[PDB]
Short mmCIF file of C-alpha atoms and ligand atoms in Angstrom, two decimals:
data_model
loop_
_atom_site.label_atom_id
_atom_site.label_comp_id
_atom_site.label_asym_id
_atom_site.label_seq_id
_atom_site.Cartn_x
_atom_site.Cartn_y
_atom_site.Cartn_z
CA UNK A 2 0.00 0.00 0.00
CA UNK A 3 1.08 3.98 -0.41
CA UNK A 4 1.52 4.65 3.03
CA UNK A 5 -0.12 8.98 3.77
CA UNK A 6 0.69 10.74 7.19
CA UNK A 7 -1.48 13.41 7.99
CA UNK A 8 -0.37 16.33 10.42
CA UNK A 9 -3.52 18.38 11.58
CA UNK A 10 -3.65 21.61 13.16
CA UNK A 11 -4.38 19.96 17.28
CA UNK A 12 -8.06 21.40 17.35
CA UNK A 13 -10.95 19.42 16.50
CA UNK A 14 -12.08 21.88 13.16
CA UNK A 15 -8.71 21.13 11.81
CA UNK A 16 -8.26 17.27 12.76
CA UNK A 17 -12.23 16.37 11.58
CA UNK A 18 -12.08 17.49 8.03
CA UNK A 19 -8.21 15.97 7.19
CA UNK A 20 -9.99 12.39 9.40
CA UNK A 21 -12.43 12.30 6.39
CA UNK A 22 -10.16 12.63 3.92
CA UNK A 23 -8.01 10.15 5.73
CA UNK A 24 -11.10 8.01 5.89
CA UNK A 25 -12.11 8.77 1.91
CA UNK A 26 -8.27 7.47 1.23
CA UNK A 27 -8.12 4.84 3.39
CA UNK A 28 -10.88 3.18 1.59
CA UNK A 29 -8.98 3.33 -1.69
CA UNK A 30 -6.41 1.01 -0.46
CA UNK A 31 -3.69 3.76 0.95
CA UNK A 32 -2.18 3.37 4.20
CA UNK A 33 -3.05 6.30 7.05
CA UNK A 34 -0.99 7.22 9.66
CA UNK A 35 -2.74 10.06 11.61
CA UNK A 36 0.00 12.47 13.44
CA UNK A 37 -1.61 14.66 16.52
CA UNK A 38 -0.01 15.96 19.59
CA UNK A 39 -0.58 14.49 23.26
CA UNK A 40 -2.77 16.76 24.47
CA UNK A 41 -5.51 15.86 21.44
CA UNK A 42 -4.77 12.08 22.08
CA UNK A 43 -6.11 12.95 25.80
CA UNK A 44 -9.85 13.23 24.21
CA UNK A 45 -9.29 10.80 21.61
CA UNK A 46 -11.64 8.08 22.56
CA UNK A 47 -12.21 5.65 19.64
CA UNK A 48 -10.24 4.78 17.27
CA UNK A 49 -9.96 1.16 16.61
CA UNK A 50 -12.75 1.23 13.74
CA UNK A 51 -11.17 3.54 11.73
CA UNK A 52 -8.25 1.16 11.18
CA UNK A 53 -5.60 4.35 11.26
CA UNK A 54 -2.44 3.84 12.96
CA UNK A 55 -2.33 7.12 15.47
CA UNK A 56 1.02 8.73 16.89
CA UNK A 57 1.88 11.20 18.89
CA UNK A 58 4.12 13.74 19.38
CA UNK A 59 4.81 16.23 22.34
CA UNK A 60 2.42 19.34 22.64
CA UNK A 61 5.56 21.20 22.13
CA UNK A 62 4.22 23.89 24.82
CA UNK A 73 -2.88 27.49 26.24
CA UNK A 74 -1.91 28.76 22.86
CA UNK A 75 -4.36 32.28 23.52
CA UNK A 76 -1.83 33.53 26.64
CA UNK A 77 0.58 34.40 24.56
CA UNK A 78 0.06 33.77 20.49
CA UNK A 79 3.40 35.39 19.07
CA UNK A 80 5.71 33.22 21.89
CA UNK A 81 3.72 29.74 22.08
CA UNK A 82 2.60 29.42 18.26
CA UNK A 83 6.37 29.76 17.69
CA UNK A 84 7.34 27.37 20.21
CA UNK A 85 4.59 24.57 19.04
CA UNK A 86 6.29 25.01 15.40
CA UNK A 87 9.82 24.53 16.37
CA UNK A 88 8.49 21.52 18.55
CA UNK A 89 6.32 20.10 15.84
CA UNK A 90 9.06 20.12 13.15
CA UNK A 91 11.66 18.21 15.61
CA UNK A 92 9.21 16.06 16.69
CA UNK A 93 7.74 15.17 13.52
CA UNK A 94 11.04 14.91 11.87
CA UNK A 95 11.72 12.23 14.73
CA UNK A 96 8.36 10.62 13.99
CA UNK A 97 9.30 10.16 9.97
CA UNK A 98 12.47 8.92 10.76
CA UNK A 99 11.05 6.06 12.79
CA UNK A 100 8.18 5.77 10.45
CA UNK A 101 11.08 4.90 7.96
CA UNK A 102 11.83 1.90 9.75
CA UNK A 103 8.63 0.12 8.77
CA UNK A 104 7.23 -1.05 5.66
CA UNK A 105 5.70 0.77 4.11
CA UNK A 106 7.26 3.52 3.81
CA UNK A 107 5.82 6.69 4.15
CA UNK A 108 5.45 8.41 0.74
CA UNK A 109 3.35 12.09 1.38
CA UNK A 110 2.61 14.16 4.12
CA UNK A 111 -0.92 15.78 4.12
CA UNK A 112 0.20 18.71 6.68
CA UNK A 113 -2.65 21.62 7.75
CA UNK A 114 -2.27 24.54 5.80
CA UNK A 115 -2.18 26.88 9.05
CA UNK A 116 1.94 24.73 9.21
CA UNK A 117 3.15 25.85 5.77
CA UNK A 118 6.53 25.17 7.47
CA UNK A 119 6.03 21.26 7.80
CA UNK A 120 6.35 21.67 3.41
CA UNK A 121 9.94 21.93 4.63
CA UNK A 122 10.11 18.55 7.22
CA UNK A 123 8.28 16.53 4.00
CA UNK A 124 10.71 17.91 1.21
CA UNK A 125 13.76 17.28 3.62
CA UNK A 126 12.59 13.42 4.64
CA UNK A 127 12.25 12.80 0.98
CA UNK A 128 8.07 12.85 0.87
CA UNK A 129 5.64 15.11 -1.10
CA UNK A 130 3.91 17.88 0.75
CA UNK A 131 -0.16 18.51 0.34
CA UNK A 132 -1.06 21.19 2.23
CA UNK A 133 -4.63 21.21 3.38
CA UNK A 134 -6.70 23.83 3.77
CA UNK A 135 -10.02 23.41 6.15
CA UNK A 136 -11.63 26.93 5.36
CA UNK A 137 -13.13 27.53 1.39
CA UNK A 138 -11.16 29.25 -1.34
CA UNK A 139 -13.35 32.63 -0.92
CA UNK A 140 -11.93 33.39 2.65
CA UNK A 141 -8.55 31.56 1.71
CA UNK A 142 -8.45 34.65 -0.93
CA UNK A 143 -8.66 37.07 1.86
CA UNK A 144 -5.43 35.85 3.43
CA UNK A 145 -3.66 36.12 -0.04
CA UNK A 146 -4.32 39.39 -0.50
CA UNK A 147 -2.97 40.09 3.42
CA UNK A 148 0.00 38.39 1.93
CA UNK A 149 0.33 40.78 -1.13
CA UNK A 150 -0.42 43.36 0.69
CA UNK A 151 -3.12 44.40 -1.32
CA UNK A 152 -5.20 44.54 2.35
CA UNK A 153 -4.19 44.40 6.28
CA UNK A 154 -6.24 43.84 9.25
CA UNK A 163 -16.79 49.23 2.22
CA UNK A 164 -14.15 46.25 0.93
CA UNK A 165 -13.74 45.09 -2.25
CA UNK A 166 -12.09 41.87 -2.98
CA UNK A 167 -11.55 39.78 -6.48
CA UNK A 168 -14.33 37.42 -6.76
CA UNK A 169 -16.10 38.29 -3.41
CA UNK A 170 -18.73 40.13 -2.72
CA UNK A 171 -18.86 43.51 -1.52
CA UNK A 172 -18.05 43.61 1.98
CA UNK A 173 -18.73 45.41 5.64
CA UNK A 174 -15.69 46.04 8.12
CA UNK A 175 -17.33 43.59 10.17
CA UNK A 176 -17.44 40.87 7.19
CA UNK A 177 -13.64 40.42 7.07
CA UNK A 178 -12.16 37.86 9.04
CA UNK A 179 -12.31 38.92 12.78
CA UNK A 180 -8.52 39.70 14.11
CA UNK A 181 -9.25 42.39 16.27
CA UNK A 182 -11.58 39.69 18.78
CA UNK A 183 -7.61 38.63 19.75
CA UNK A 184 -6.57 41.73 21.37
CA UNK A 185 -2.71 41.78 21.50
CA UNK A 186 -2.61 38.37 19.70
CA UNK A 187 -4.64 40.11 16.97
CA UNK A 188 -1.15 41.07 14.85
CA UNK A 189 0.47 37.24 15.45
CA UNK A 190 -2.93 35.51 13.87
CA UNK A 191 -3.28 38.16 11.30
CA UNK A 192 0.45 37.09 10.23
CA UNK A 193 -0.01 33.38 10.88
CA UNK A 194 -3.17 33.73 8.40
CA UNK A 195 -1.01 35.40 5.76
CA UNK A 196 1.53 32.86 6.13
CA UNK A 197 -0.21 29.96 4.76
CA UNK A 198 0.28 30.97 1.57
CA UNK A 199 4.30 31.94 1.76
CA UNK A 200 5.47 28.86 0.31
CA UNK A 201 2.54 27.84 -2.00
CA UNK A 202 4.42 27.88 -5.33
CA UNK A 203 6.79 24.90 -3.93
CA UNK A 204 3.88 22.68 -2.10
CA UNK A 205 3.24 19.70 -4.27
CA UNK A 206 -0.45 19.48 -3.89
CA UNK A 207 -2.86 22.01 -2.25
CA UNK A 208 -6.18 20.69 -1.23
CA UNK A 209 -8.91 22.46 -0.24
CA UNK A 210 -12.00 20.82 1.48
CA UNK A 211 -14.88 22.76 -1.14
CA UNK A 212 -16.75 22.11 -4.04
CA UNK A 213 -16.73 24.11 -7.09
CA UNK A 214 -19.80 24.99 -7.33
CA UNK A 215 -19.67 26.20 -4.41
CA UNK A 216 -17.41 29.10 -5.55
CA UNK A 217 -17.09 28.61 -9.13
CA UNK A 218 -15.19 32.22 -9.87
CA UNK A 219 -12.90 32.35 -7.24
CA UNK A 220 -11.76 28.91 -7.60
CA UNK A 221 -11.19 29.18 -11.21
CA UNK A 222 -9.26 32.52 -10.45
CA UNK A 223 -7.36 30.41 -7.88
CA UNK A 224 -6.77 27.81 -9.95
CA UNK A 225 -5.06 29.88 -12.40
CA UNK A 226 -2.61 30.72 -10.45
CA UNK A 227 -1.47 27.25 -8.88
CA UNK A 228 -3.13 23.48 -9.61
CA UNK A 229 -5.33 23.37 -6.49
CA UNK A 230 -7.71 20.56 -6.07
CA UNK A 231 -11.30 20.60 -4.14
CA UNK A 232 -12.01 17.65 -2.28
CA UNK A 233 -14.79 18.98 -0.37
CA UNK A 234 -17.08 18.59 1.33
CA UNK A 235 -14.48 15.33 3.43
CA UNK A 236 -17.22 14.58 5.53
CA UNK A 237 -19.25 11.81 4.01
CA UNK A 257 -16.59 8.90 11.49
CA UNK A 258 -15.48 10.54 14.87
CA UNK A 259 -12.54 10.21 17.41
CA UNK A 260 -13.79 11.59 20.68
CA UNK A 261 -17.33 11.30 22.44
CA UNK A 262 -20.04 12.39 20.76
CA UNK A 263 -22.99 10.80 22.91
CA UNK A 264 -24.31 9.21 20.01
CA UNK A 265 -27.20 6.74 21.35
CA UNK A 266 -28.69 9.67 23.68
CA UNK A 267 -28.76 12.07 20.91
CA UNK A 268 -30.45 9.80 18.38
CA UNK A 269 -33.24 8.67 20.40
CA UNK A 270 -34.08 12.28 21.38
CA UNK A 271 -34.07 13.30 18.11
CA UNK A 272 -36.11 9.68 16.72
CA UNK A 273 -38.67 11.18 19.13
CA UNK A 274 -39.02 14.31 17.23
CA UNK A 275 -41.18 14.73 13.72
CA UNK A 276 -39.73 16.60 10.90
CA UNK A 277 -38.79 20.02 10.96
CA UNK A 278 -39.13 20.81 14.88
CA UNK A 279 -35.69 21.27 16.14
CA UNK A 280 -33.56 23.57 16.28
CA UNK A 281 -29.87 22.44 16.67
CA UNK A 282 -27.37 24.62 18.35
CA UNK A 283 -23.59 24.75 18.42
CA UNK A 284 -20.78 27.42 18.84
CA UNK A 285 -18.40 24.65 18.18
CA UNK A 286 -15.47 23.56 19.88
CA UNK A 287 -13.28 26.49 20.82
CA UNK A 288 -15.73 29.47 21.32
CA UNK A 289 -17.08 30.39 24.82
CA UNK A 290 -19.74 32.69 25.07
CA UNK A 291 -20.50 34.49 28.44
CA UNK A 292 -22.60 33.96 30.95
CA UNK A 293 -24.40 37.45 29.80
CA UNK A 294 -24.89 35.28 26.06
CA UNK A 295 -25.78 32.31 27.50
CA UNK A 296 -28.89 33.22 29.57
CA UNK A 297 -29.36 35.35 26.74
CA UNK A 298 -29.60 32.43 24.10
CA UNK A 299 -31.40 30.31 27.36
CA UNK A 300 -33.84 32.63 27.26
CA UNK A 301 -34.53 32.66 23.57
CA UNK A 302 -34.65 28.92 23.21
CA UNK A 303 -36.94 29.00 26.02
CA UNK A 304 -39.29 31.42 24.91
CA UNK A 305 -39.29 30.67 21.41
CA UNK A 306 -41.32 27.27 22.42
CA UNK A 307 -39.77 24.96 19.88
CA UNK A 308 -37.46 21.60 20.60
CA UNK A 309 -33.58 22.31 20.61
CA UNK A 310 -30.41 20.28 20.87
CA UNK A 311 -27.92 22.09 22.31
CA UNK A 312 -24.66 21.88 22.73
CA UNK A 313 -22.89 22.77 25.16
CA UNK A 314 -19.35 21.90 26.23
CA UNK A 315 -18.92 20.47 29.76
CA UNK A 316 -16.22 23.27 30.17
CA UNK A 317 -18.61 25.84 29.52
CA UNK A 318 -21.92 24.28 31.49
CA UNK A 319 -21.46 26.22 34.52
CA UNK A 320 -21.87 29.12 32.67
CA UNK A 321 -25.73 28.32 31.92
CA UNK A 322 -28.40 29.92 34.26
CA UNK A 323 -28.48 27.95 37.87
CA UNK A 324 -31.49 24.99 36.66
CA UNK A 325 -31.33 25.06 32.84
CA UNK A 326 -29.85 21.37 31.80
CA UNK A 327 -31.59 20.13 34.79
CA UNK A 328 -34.93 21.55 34.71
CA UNK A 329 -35.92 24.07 32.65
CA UNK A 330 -34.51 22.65 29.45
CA UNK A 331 -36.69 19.45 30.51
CA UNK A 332 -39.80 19.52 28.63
CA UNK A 333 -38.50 20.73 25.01
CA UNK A 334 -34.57 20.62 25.43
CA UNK A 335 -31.54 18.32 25.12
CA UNK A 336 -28.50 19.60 26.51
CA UNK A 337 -25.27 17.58 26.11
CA UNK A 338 -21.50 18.37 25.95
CA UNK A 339 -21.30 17.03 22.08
CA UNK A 340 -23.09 15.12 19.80
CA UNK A 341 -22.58 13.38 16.44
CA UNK A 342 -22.97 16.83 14.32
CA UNK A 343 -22.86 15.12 11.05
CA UNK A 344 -25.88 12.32 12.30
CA UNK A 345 -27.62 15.45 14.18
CA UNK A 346 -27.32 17.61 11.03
CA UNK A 347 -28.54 14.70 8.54
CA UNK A 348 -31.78 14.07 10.50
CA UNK A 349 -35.33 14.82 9.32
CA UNK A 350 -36.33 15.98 12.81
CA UNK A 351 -33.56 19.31 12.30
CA UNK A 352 -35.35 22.29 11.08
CA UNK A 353 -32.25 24.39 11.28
CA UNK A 354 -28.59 25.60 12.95
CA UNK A 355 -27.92 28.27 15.21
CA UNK A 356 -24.34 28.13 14.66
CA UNK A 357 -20.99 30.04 14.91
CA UNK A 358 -19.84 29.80 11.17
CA UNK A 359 -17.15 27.97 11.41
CA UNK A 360 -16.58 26.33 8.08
CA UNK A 361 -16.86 22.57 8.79
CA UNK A 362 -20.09 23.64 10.67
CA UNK A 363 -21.34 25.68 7.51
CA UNK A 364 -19.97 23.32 5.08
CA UNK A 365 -22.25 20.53 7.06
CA UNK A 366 -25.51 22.22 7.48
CA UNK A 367 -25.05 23.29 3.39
CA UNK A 368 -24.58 19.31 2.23
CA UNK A 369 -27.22 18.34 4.55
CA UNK A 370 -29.87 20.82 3.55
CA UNK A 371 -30.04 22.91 6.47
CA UNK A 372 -30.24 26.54 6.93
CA UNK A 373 -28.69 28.46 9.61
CA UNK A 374 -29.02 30.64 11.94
CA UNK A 375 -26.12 33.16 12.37
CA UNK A 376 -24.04 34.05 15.24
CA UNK A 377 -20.56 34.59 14.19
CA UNK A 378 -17.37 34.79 17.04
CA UNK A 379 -14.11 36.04 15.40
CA UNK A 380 -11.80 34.66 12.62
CA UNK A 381 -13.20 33.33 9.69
CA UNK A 382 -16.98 33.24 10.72
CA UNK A 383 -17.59 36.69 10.19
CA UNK A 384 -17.01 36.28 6.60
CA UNK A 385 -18.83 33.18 6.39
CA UNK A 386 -21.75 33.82 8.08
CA UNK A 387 -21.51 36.70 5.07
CA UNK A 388 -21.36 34.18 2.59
CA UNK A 389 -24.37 32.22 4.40
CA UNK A 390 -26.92 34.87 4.43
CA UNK A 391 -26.16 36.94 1.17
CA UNK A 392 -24.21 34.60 -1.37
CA UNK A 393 -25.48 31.35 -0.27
CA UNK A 394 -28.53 32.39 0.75
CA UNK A 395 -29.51 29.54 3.02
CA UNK A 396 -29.46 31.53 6.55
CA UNK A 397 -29.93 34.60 8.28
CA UNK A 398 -27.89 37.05 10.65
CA UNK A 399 -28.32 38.11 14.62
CA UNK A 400 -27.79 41.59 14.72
CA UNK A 401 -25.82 42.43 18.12
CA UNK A 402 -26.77 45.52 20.73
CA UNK A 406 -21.85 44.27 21.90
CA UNK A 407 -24.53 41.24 23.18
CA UNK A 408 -27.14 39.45 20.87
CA UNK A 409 -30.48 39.46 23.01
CA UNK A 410 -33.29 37.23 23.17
CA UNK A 411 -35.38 39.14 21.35
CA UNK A 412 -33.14 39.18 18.42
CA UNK A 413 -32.30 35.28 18.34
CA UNK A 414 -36.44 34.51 18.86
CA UNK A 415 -36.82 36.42 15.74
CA UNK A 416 -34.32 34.50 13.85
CA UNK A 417 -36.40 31.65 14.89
CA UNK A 418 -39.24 32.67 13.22
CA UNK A 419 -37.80 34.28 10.02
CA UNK A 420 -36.72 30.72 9.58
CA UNK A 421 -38.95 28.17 11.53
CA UNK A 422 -42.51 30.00 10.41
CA UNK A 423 -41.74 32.83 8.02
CA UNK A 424 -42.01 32.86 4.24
CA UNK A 425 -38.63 33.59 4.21
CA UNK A 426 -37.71 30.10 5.63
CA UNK A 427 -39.23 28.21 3.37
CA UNK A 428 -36.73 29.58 0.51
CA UNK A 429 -33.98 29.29 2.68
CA UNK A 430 -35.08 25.84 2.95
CA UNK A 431 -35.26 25.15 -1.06
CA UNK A 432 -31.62 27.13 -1.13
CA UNK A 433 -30.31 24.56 1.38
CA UNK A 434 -31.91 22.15 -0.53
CA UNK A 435 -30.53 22.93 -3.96
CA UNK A 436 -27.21 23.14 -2.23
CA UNK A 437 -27.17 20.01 -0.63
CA UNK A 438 -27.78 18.07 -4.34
CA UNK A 439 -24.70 20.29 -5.58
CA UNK A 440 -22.17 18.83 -2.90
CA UNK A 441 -23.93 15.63 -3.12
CA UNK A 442 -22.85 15.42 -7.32
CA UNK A 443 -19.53 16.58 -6.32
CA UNK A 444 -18.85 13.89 -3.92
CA UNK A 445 -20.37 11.43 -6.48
CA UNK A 446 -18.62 9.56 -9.68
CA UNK A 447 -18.00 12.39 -12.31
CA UNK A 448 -18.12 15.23 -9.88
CA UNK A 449 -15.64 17.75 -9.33
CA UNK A 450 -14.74 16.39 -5.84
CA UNK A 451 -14.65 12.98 -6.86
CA UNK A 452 -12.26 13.44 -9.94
CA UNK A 453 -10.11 15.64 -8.20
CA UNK A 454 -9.73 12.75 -4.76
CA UNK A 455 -9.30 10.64 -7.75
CA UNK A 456 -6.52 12.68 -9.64
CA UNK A 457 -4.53 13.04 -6.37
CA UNK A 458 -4.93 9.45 -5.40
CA UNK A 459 -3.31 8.25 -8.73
CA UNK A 460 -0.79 10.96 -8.89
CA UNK A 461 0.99 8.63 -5.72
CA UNK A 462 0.98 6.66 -8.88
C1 Q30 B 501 -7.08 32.55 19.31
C2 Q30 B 501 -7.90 31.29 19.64
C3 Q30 B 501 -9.23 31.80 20.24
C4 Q30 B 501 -10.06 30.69 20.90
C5 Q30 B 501 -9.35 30.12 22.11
O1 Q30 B 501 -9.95 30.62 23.32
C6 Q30 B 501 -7.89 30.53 22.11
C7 Q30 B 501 -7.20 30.42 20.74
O2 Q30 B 501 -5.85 30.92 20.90
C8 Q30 B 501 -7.02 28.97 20.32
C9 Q30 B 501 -6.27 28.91 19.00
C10 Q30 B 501 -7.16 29.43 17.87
C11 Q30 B 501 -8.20 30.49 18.33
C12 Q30 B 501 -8.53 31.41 17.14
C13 Q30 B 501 -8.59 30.68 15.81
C14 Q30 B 501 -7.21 30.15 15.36
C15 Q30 B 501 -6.50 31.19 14.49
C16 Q30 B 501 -7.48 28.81 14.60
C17 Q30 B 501 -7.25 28.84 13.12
C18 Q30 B 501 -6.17 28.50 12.44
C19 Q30 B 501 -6.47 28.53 11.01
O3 Q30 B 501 -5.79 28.27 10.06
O4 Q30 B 501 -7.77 28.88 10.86
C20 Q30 B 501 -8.25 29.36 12.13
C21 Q30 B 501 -6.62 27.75 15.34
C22 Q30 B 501 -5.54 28.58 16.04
C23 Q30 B 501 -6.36 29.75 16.60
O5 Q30 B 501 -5.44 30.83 16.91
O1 UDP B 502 -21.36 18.68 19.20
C1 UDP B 502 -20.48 18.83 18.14
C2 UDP B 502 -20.06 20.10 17.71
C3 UDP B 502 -19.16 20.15 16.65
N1 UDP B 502 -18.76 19.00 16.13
C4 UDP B 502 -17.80 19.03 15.03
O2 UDP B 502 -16.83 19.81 15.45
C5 UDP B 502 -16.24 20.56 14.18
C6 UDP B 502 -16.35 22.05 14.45
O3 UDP B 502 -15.68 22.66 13.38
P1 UDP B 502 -15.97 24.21 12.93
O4 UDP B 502 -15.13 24.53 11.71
O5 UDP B 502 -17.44 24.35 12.60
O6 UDP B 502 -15.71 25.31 14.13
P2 UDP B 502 -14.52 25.31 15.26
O7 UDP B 502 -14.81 24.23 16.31
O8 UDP B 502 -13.19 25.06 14.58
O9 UDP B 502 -14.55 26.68 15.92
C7 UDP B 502 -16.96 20.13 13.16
O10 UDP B 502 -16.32 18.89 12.60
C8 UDP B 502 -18.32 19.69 13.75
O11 UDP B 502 -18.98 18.75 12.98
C9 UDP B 502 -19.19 17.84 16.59
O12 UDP B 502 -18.76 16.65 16.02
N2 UDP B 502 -20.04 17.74 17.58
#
């Protein structure tokens, strides 16, 4: 077999999308050997399906205390330690041939090219936001704005930088850099569809031979409190719940949470809500226990992908991060809008006015009730639901042809699979 090692970024929206792919390419007959750090291994919790040989490598440092200092330190402790990994990997058959490395390391193209491998770097967020850190690169922008191939956008539609504070100028630069070295990287993936983004893709792929393999997801390493979540929702008819999920690194405050409580509350329909067991005691005093009784399930994770693909899920308050867009698009499901920082901003942007299959919480800087109960019914009752529905809909059946024999997905998964040759 052509043995792959794939290096994610050690947070779950940067490990999940590269695990499909792993998963897509481990059922063509390659070899996987999944790289992550000790502290992801930690929450790792099953893994023997998958048939993926795991290792692990130091932490190498808590990133948010100090980005400049410890986002330097994990680097220079992820290329020793990885370069210490390959060489043992090189004492077993088979060999490892390519290293599929996040695109947020564009200095791992360096540990591949020196242990004799190719380098794919893999980007987890679409070609229409990847465009935005380009042009930070050029310099043709820095952290009304117009943009090749993007719509027109707000101040508050870029990516969100200034959420970080003093970190704000070492993510700003860390964004820019994954695109200093894309001329040498011998295949860059990115985890879209065409269709999706049809002119800045093509503008994109003029400049370098970039393949879309997206959407990966077609399943999960840590606990997702599968059977609880799939009765609830088997005892809920089509089109009554509301799923909600800021995802696995934001933490809203307590001032957000009651305010969201509140709104779920209120708004009288069924919800599934996520909530990270970190961030429970955060949630008014009785809520999980009591209050959220009669119409609510609230549980620390769930399987998103299962949640998202079932009949009973009439839409998703989410955070915008793009695996969680990406999902709710193939699976038909429009969203509710409550972007955090980075990347969201601009795709909740693409969401509500490109996409067109969700709408947009206008803050006060806290969203209120109010606000989120009317989202509710712009999407749940309103006119206007209904066509973000069919949007969703139509959207779905484009990702689905993509994944499928002849699509632009499939062909390009296919084209990268048999240039390992
Ligand atoms: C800064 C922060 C904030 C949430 C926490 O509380 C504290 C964090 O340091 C955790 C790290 C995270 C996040 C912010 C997003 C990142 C830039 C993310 C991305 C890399 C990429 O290519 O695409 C986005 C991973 C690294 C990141 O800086
Ligand atoms: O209860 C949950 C919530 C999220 N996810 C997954 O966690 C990832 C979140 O990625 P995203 O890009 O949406 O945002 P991030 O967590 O990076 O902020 C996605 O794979 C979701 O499907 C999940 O499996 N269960």
């Amino acid at each position: 077999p052509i043995h792959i090692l794939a290096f994610p970024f050690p947070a779950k929206g940067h490990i999940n999308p590269l695990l499909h792919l792993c998963n897509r390419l481990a059922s063509k007959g390659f070899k996987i050997t999944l790289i992550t750090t000790v502290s992801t291994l930690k929450s790792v919790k099953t893994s023997k399906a998958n048939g993926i040989d795991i290792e692990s490598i130091p932490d190498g440092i808590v990133m948010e205390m100090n980005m400049e200092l410890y986002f330097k330190q994990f680097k220079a402790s992820a290329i020793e330690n990885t370069t210490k990994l390959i060489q043992k990997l090189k004492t077993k058959n088979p060999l490892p041939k390519v290293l599929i490395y996040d695109s947020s390391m564009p200095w791992i193209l360096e540990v591949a090219h020196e242990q004799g491998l190719l380098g794919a770097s893999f980007f987890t967020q679409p070609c229409s936001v990847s465009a935005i850190y380009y042009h930070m690169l050029q310099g043709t922008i820095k952290l009304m704005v117009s943009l090749p191939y993007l719509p027109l956008l707000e101040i508050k539609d870029l990516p969100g930088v200034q959420q970080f504070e003093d970190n704000s100028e070492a993510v700003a630069e860390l964004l820019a850099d994954q695109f200093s070295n894309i001329d040498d990287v011998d295949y860059v993936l990115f985890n879209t569809f065409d269709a999706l983004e049809i002119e800045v893709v093509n503008w994109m792929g003029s400049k370098w031979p970039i393949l879309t393999v997206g959407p990966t997801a077609p399943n999960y390493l840590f606990e997702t409190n599968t059977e609880v979540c799939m009765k609830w929702l088997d005892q809920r008819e089509i089109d009554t719940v509301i799923y909600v999920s800021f995802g696995s690194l934001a933490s809203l405050t307590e001032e957000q949470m009651e305010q969201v409580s509140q709104a779920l509350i209120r708004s009288n329909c069924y919800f599934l809500w996520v909530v990270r067991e970190e961030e429970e005691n955060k949630l008014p005093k009785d809520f999980k226990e009591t209050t959220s009784k009669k119409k609510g399930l609230v549980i620390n994770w769930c399987p998103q992908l299962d949640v998202l693909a079932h009949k009973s899920v009439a839409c998703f308050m989410t955070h915008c991060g793009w695996n969680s867009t990406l999902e709710a698009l193939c699976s038909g499901v429009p969203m509710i809008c409550m972007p955090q920082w980075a990347d969201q901003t601009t795709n909740a942007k693409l969401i509500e006015h490109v996409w067109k299959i969700g709408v947009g919480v206008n803050k006060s800087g806290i969203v209120k009730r109010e606000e989120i109960e009317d989202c509710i019914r712009q999407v749940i009752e309103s006119e206007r639901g209904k066509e973000l529905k069919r949007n969703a809909i139509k959207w779905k059946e484009l990702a689905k042809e993509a994944v499928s024999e002849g699509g632009s997905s499939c062909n390009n998964i296919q084209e990268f699979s048999s240039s390992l040759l």
